[PDB]
Specification:
It is found in: Nucleus. Interacts with WWTR1. Transcription factor for the thyroid-specific expression of the genes exclusively expressed in the thyroid cell type, maintaining the functional differentiation of such cells. The chain folds into two domains: 77 residues, Winged helix-like DNA-binding domain superfamily/Winged helix DNA-binding domain (Arc Repressor Mutant, subunit A, Orthogonal Bundle); 82 residues, no CATH class. By secondary structure, it is mainly α. The termini are far apart. The chain contains six helices and no strands. Helix 2 crosses helix 3 and helix 4 packs across helix 5.
């Protein structure tokens, strides 16, 4: 699905770096000329003299109106994200310390009831769990004797 046409292919082959020559993109020299002549205040009937140009030429030269589309430092923006501190995880830990009988998912509400954090920002039940274990867990192992096979049942008879 081609979402509208685009300017495929180059604009021929620009020479580039024509220092006040020709085919010169964002020629800072132009900005500098206009700024200079504007400073001492060269009237249009005298721009014509200095550059040896007409009057329509003078209009284009003096009146750049954003020099090859530049000289305009500005761009509008803004944002409003739902940010909060990770320290709320520590507060779950503390509320475990204050009230250990209340479970992970109970202490999740202990914050909201008091009005400490927002319903979004309150940390995951699965995350707060990882703190609890360092205080109160049992090691995940139970070694014992096992795998002890054997045999011995062989007989013979004769007259």
């Amino acid at each position: 699905m081609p979402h509208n046409s685009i300017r495929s292919g180059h604009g021929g082959l620009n020479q580039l770096g024509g220092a006040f020559v020709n085919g010169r993109p964002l020629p800072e020299v132009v900005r500098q000329r206009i700024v200079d002549l504007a400073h001492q205040g060269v009237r249009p009937c005298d721009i014509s003299r200095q550059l040896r140009v007409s009057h329509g030429c003078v209009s284009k030269i003096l009146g750049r109106y954003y020099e090859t589309g530049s000289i305009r430092p500005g761009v509008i923006g803004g944002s409003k994200p739902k940010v909060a501190t990770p320290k709320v995880v520590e507060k779950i830990g503390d509320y475990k310390r204050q009230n250990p009988t209340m479970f992970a998912w109970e202490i999740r509400d202990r914050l909201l009831a008091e009005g400490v954090c927002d319903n979004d920002t309150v940390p995951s039940v699965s995350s707060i769990n990882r703190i609890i274990r360092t205080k109160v867990q049992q090691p995940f192992n139970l070694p014992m004797d096992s795998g002890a096979p054997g045999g011995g049942s062989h007989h013979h008879h004769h007259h």
